[PDB]
Amino acid sequence: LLPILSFPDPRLRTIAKPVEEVTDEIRQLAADMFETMYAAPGIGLAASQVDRHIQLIVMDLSESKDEPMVFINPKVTPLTEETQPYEEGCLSVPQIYDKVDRPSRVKIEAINLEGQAFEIEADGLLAVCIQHEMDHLNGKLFVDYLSPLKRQRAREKVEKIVRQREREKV
C-alpha cells in the first residue's frame, strides 16, 4: 500500500510532469495505485496523491474492483457550457464530501498502459472523476471550489482523521 498524501501537504500542490515512455516501472506504479485506491476505498487516484508527480491517473467507477482504467498524459476539453453539480470526495481529503460544479460532457485524450492514444467522450460520473483527477495533476484540490470556512473545517478534520489512522497502527 502506497501512503496517500493528505490535505494540506504542500506536495499535493506540485504540477505533475508528463510520462516520457510507459516503462515497466510505470506499469508496477499504476498497479501499486489501483491497490491503494481499492483499499481506501475509492473510485479515482492521481500519482500526485502518492507523491509521484507524473501524468498518471488510475480509475474504476464499477460497483466491483472489475472495470479498471488508466490515463497517462491526459488532456480534457469541455464539450459544452452545461455544468452538473456532484457530491465529490477525495482520498487526499479523507471523510469530507461537498457539491462541486463542473462541465457535464468533456473529451478525454490520453495514453493507455500499452502506449496507445485514445480519444473518448464522457458524461455523468466519468466526466466528474477525470476533471477531479486532472486537477490533482495541476496541484488543485476539490476543496479549492469550496468557501474557506468549509476548507478550514476540512483542514482541522483531516489532521484529526490522519492522527487516528496513525493511532490505529499502534
Ligand SMILES: [Zn+2]
Ligand atoms: Zn482527489
